[PDB]
Amino acid sequence: GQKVHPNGIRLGIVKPWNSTWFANTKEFADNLDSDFKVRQYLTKELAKASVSRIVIERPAKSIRVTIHTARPGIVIGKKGEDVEKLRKVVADIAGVPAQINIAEVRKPELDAKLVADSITSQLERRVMFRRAMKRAVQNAMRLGAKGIKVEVSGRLGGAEIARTEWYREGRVPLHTLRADIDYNTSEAHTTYGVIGVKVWIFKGEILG
Amino acid sequence: PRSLKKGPFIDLHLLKKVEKAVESGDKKPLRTWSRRSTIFPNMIGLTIAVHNGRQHVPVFVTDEMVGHKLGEFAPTRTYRGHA
Amino acid sequence: VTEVEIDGVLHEYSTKEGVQEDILEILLNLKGLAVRVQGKDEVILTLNKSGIGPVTAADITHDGDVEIVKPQHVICHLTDENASISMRIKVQRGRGYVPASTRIHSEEDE
Amino acid sequence: NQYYGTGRRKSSAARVFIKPGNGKIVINQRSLEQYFGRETARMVVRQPLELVDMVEKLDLYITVKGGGISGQAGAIRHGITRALMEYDESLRSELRKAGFVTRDARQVERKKVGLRKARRRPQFSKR
Amino acid sequence: RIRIRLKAFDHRLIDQATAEIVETAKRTGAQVRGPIPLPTRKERFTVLISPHVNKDARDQYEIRTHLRLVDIVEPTEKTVDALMRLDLAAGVDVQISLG
Amino acid sequence: AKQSMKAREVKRVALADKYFAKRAELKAIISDVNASDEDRWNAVLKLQTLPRDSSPSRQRNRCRQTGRPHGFLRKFGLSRIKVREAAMRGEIPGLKKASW
Amino acid sequence: PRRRVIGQRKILPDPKFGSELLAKFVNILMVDGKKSTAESIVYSALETLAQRSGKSELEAFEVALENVRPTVEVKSRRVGGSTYQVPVEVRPVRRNALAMRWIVEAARKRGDKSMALRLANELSDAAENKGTAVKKREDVHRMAEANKAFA
RNA sequence: AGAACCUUACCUGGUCUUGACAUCCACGGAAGUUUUCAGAGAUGAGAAUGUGCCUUCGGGAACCGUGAGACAGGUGCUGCAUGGCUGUCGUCAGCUCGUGUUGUGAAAUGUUGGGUUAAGUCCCGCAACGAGCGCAACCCUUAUCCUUUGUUGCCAGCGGUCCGGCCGGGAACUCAAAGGAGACUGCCAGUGAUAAACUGGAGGAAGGUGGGGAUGACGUCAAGUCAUCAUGCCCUUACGACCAGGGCUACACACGUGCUACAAUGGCGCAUACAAAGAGAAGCGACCUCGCGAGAGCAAGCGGACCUCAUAAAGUGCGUCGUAGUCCGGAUUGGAGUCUGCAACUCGACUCCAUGAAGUCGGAAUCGCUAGUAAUCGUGGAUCAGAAUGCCACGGUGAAUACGU
């Protein structure tokens, strides 16, 4: 289990946190649990909507969710009909006043998580994994990624002996802390088993 | 051992049974699982078949057994020898 | 005033429950507002009010460093007592005239 | 008028003040002999002074916190050296030669997961 | 006097908050004490990173809780109330205490 | 862990929540040196009568996501494994890898 | 080591006499990083020794050391099938160390009661040219002599 | 990162079967609240209260009850079907690719060669020219300085004193964070191929990657984990669920890792000095009183630079013991008890009084460590009701040695 998590190593420097609140040792665990719940719910709901990052932020006994999604239109539905619906359920989950914001993700081919999800979907609907991977890589490159890597693993083409294959393009420096490396993962629950998809997308280096 | 201020321990049900026995004046063995129960003065004379995990083993109570517990006279493990 | 956020709204050409001015009238009366911040350069106010009667500018739940210098600036005319309105205004700071068309793609913060 | 130098060594932090006088040393409102029972410590605090003949010339008031004894002494010495540097500024070379201007940066190495200590690895066996 | 205890995980954020609070104080009232930095709590955690077994395999995390002590010496009419409407940025637990 | 175990834990917790006032009172009574012997005895017996799952020393801290009894942390309410994952994802606020 | 020779670390002279050698000796004596006790012991040894032989504390010690320093030690090359012990001229820094170590060992061995006393006795023996350290030195020399053919 | 119960997955009995855990209807009842006897308990039988959000009244959503099935459930098997996560060679300096060229081709070249470096590090050459992942740097920490801000932290100079920074105060110093500066072979000399570098010295707190951490290339071991989790045959009145008791703590024996010893560089007694880093609300618990003591009682201060844990110990001084199986050593066992806990029999920790094994430095062999390291000394934390000699942290004292390959 060689490698360090690319997001996790960079949280202090170039990457920010998702859950962004303060709490004392008393209420912290509970808060975490709540976050887990709400996030889980959101994932369940907005599966068909291309959702990248849920950012929870709770000040003053009131939860502020921020959903980063590629297509707001399907998450919002009719203007303030679906969002509103989501909100009350979120509140219920939390046990506090809820507030949902929806950030529009520019360039969903450069968002790593989204790409991974897409790949997983493709796998599920029985495409050639390799061709999917290629598409993922190519598209990102076209869009202006300084580099991208993707990796898929296990029961590829329903084969008895599992293996991993991966496509890199451009440069993807992981040891370099100041590199904006959007990393994320997904899992294709195929007929032969799970197929895990990792993808690293290098936006560029930050100078500060 | 248990604190002196707390007193001795005996299971309530067991105690009740003992009392009943005393009242009767019978000497049929009382099958019991309360190995943790301390023996009492009033229990002297009674046979009380204490569980050892597997079976109830008869224990005729004596004047010397009072301070002790019922599980002390009902050994659980059954080792004969290595050869 | 730059961005106005009313709850239970779809577009600015709709109408709302319990008010007089329509939403374009509310946006014009908010465009006339006169705010004076001191420390920050971008603040978010809050206006919450229910009950029959006009909604002055003096009903905005002010923070410490914002000063609303027109306490008789009318915005809405709430007529139903079961009606409510909860808008969240955003006040930037600049110069000149920057309009909605140019600020339709200029805005970077998604 | 009193001159000054900060002392630091291990987790100790001495506050040495130099004044002109007869040569009486006070460390936390106690004499040098009272505070440092150890001879070595005493020697180390007197070293710089010995090196530059100003033992009888100047009094020094000290307060030190943190660390043990030896470390504390070292810190004090450092402080004294600093004070001297501040005060004369022509004795620097001698101090450098001695090796007193140098802050001894040796801190205790942290314990590391896996190991029992900073470097002691646990007992190995092939079988 | 109003003592104010700012607590947060992000240091920059905390700093920002503190400045804001000072600003709020200084316009209305007079003689703000100042933003005094107290010691940071570095609450560390070790965990085994293997699912099953490998004990020397470990990750050591920590949460740096920063403290900022802002004090206000003269509470006027205008000043104290100004904070009511003036909420601070999220992820910064404030704790005002007069006297 | 199993579902069943989790359920059991929940039940225990519920019991604890229920019987706290009474149990505590009983304990106090038992302790109180300035009290009758008979009363004390009664209290001791009373305690026995109450359900076992009512005790707080019965309930085990499990992970709030997986129910794993071992490797638990109190601050997070999560087992080590899950905690790490959370940290990696950015889901625990303030938590990052520490070096010194 | 393979890569790089390194400069020997700085050693402070002892507070009593102002000597590097003495300090080194004290260090050698020391156990469990209890330097102070060891130094006290050393001092005690010196004082008794001084009383015994006259002279000074330091001078006497030096003299004692001199009688246990080895001119030549041996090392195992073993190029052949069987091992050949080869003599080598032992350098100034090392020789001094070795003698001290030997003395310490002797002291440790010795049947007298207090450590300091034992040390003193050992020193005296060295001065006179009898005892354990001296014997060891002789043995070392003897071995070298035996294997003088190798050079 | 903590088995008395619980945990628990195992055994023995006692029990349940759409079920402990969910969703779905049907229709019986508001949920729930209190209490009673039998039972080891699980469970199996009683007495009191309530009818809230809405009805062209065939009724509803929360929460119990019963039956049907659809299903639940499985720490059951396969890590040789998998994902994820982990170890490992190894923080070893390597592993590749594109285009070109060489070869019928597998392939080669680049990546070799002269030097150099911790480094496929850098230069020079050269059928290679370029690129990527890694060897470096960016990140944390530690070593010096400066600016800012000074309470709960500090006391240099001032006045007062209960001689306590405690109180006027002061913002110096320590310290506390936040932001900057600083180290780059940059400067000097020599060696070197007109080089990359190397050797020394100057300054400097720091010198050649300053010390330490994080960071683990392509891959290897069908390495580990289906019992964290997820996931592609088997059980479903039982390989599921509830309960009480027992077991996981057994004991001819063998091995691993530790602690404590065998003593005088020490043991014991009395006095006495100098830390760091942490934790704390079903929590840490001063002072005072009682107890030989573990503790008990009373009970402030404190979500904490404030109060509490909390006396650091080794050390230092004075006394004693005088090489003994001892005033070394503490196992073992008896008595009596303290606390936690429904509950300390199996099987907790700690205390007191007694008891006082083996052991006098350990065979063959075998491990760690190059500096604030080893060695030794205490201190804290996590899990945790209680239960560490383990683990993870912190400072104290503080060596030896490196000729060389």
Q: What are the structural domains of chain C?
A: 1-110 (2.170.120.12)
Contact E10/F94, CB-based, under 8 Å? yes
Helix ranges (H only) for B1-83 are 12-24
Helix ranges (H only) for chain A are 6-9, 28-45, 72-76, 82-94, 112-124, 129-143
- CB neighbour class for G42 (10 Å; exposed up to 12, middle 13-18, buried from 19): buried
Task: Choose among D71, D98, D49, D39: nearest CA to G18.
Answer: D39
Interface contact C71, partner A, CB < 8 A: no
Please state, as a whole number, how many other Cβ atoms lie within 10 Å of the Cβ of residue D43: 19
- Beta strand C84-91 pairing with A63-69: unpaired
Are F and E neighbours with ≥3 CB pairs closer than 8 A? yes
Which residue reads 């909860």 in tokens? C86
Cβ-proximal residues to A131 (8 Å cutoff; 6+ apart), any chain = none
Q: Which two tokens stand for residue A44?
A: 């369940």
- CB neighbour class for D34 (10 Å; exposed up to 12, middle 13-18, buried from 19): exposed
Nucleotide nearest to F45 in CA–C1' terms: H342
Largest CA distance in chain E: 63
Contact E45/F96, CB-based, under 8 Å? no
Distance, in Å, from the CA atom of F44 to the CA atom of E99, rounded to the nearest integer, reads 48
Q: Which two tokens stand for residue F58?
A: 């019965």
Rounded to the nearest 10 degrees, what angle do helices G20-29 and G92-109 cross at?
40
Distance, in Å, from the CA atom of B55 to the CA atom of B76, rounded to the nearest integer, reads 9
Chain F interface with B: residues with Cβ < 8 Å: 41, 44-45, 48
Which residue reads 């102070």 in tokens? G36
Q: Which two tokens stand for residue G15?
A: 């507070």
Q: Angle at the Cα of C22 (from C20 to C23), degrees rounded to 5?
A: 135
* Helix (H/G/I), strand (E/B), else coil: A168: strand
Q: What is the DSSP letter of G31?
A: B
Q: What is the DSSP letter of B69?
A: B
Distance, in Å, from the CA atom of F27 to the CA atom of F32, rounded to the nearest integer, reads 9
The answer to whether residues A112 and A149 touch, using CB atoms and an 8 Å cutoff, is no
Cβ-proximal residues to G2 (8 Å cutoff; 6+ apart), any chain = none
Distance, in Å, from the CA atom of C22 to the CA atom of C14, rounded to the nearest integer, reads 8
Buried b (16+ CB within 10 A) or exposed e, A139-177: bbbeeebbbbbbbbebbbeeeeeeeeeebebeebebeeb
Residues of chain C immediately before an interruption (C to N > 2.5 Å): none
Backbone φ and ψ for A141, nearest 5 degrees, come out as: -60, -45
Contact A58/E90, CB-based, under 8 Å? yes
Q: Which two tokens stand for residue F18?
A: 């229920």
Backbone φ and ψ for B19, nearest 5 degrees, come out as: -60, -45
Please state, as a whole number, how many other Cβ atoms lie within 10 Å of the Cβ of residue E38: 12
The answer to whether residues A6 and F51 touch, using CB atoms and an 8 Å cutoff, is no
Edge to edge, what strands does the sheet with B48-51 contain?
B30-32, B48-51, B56-57
- For the four alpha carbons of F35, F38, F39 and F42, in that order, the dihedral sign comes to positive
- Beta strand C3-6 pairing with A179-189: unpaired
Distances (CA, A) of B82 to B45, C25, F35: 37, 100, 56
Task: Choose among F51, F2, F62: nearest CA to F23.
Answer: F51
Nucleotides of H under 7 A from a protein CB: 1-2, 5-9, 11-12, 20-21, 33-34, 39-42, 72-75, 79, 81-90, 118, 131-145, 149-152, 155-157, 173-179, 199, 203-206, 210-220, 222, 224-232, 240-247, 250-252, 255-258, 264-266, 273-282, 296-297, 303-305, 312-317, 322-323, 337-346, 366-376, 382-386, 391-405
- List beta partners, residue C66: C37
The one-letter amino acid code at F34 reads N
The answer to whether residues C60 and C76 touch, using CB atoms and an 8 Å cutoff, is no
Distance, in Å, from the CA atom of F77 to the CA atom of F89, rounded to the nearest integer, reads 17
The answer to whether residues C4 and C27 touch, using CB atoms and an 8 Å cutoff, is yes
Q: Can you give the residue ranges of every domain in chain A?
A: 16-106, 107-206
Buried b (16+ CB within 10 A) or exposed e, A102-111: beebeebbbb
Backbone φ and ψ for A77, nearest 5 degrees, come out as: 65, -125
Distance, in Å, from the CA atom of G11 to the CA atom of E75, rounded to the nearest integer, reads 62
Residue spans of beta strands (DSSP E) within G22-104: 72-76, 85-89
Distance, in Å, from the CA atom of C84 to the CA atom of C78, rounded to the nearest integer, reads 8
- List beta partners, residue F72: F79
Buried b (16+ CB within 10 A) or exposed e, F12-25: beebbeebeeebee
Q: Would you give the end-to-end CA distance of chain A in angstroms?
A: 32
CA A144 to C1' H127 (Å) is 34
Backbone φ and ψ for A32, nearest 5 degrees, come out as: -60, -45
Could you please report the per-residue DSSP string of E32-62?
Answer: EEEEEE---EEEEEEEE-SSSS-TT-EEEEE
Distances (CA, A) of D62 to A107, D6, D53, D70, G86: 66, 10, 20, 16, 58
Backbone φ and ψ for G48, nearest 5 degrees, come out as: -60, -45
Backbone φ and ψ for G129, nearest 5 degrees, come out as: 85, 40
The answer to whether residues A205 and A176 touch, using CB atoms and an 8 Å cutoff, is yes
Distance, in Å, from the CA atom of F91 to the CA atom of A36, rounded to the nearest integer, reads 8
- List beta partners, residue E44: E62
Contact F45/B12, CB-based, under 8 Å? yes
Please state, as a whole number, how many other Cβ atoms lie within 10 Å of the Cβ of residue A13: 14
Give which of E28, E76, E85 to mutate to test C binding, by max C Cβ within 10 Å. Answer: E85
Contact E20/C61, CB-based, under 8 Å? no
Q: Would you give the end-to-end CA distance of chain G in angstroms?
A: 24
* Helix (H/G/I), strand (E/B), else coil: C88: strand
Q: Angle at the Cα of G74 (from G70 to G76), degrees rounded to 5?
A: 160
The answer to whether residues F93 and A19 touch, using CB atoms and an 8 Å cutoff, is yes
Q: How many CA atoms lie within 13 A of A158 on its CB side?
A: 6
Q: What is the DSSP letter of C105?
A: T
* Helix (H/G/I), strand (E/B), else coil: E94: coil
Distance, in Å, from the CA atom of B27 to the CA atom of B35, rounded to the nearest integer, reads 20
* Helix (H/G/I), strand (E/B), else coil: B65: helix
Distance, in Å, from the CA atom of A19 to the CA atom of A32, rounded to the nearest integer, reads 8
Task: Choose among A107, A129, A111: nearest CA to A120.
Answer: A129
- CB neighbour class for A135 (10 Å; exposed up to 12, middle 13-18, buried from 19): middle
Q: Which two tokens stand for residue C58?
A: 């003096």
Give which of A21, A22, A66 to mutate to test E binding, by max E Cβ within 10 Å. Answer: A22
Distance, in Å, from the CA atom of A26 to the CA atom of A33, rounded to the nearest integer, reads 13
Contact G39/D40, CB-based, under 8 Å? yes
Distances (CA, A) of G74 to D64, G2, G86: 51, 22, 5
Q: How far is F78 from chain E (nearest CA, A)?
A: 11
In this complex, the chains that touch D, judged by 3 or more CB pairs closer than 8 A, are E, G
Q: Which two tokens stand for residue A125?
A: 């609907």
* Helix (H/G/I), strand (E/B), else coil: A111: coil
- Residues of chain A with Cβ-Cβ distance to F97 below 8 Å are 8-9
Backbone φ and ψ for E46, nearest 5 degrees, come out as: -105, 145
Backbone φ and ψ for A204, nearest 5 degrees, come out as: 155, 175
Q: What is the DSSP letter of B41?
A: G
Residue of A nearest to C10 (CA): A79
Q: How many CA atoms lie within 13 A of F37 on its CB side?
A: 4
The one-letter amino acid code at C14 reads S
In this complex, the chains that touch C, judged by 3 or more CB pairs closer than 8 A, are A, E
- For the four alpha carbons of C38, C44, C48 and C53, in that order, the dihedral sign comes to positive
Q: Which two tokens stand for residue D37?
A: 């029972």
- List beta partners, residue A92: none
Which residue reads 């605090």 in tokens? D45
Distance, in Å, from the CA atom of E6 to the CA atom of E97, rounded to the nearest integer, reads 11
The answer to whether residues C14 and C95 touch, using CB atoms and an 8 Å cutoff, is no
Cβ-proximal residues to D105 (8 Å cutoff; 6+ apart), any chain = none
What technique determined this structure? cryo-EM
Q: Angle at the Cα of F53 (from F48 to F57), degrees rounded to 5?
A: 90
Q: What is the DSSP letter of B63?
A: G
Please state, as a whole number, how many other Cβ atoms lie within 10 Å of the Cβ of residue G128: 12
Please state, as a whole number, how many other Cβ atoms lie within 10 Å of the Cβ of residue D50: 12
The one-letter amino acid code at G133 reads A
Largest CA distance in chain G: 54
- For the four alpha carbons of C96, C97, C101 and C104, in that order, the dihedral sign comes to positive
Q: How many CA atoms lie within 13 A of A76 on its CB side?
A: 18
Q: How many helices (H) and strands (E) does chain G have?
A: 6, 2
Q: Angle at the Cα of F89 (from F87 to F95), degrees rounded to 5?
A: 25
Backbone φ and ψ for E69, nearest 5 degrees, come out as: -100, 105
Task: Choose among A159, A151, A161, A152: nearest CA to A192.
Answer: A159
Entry resolution in angstroms?
4.1
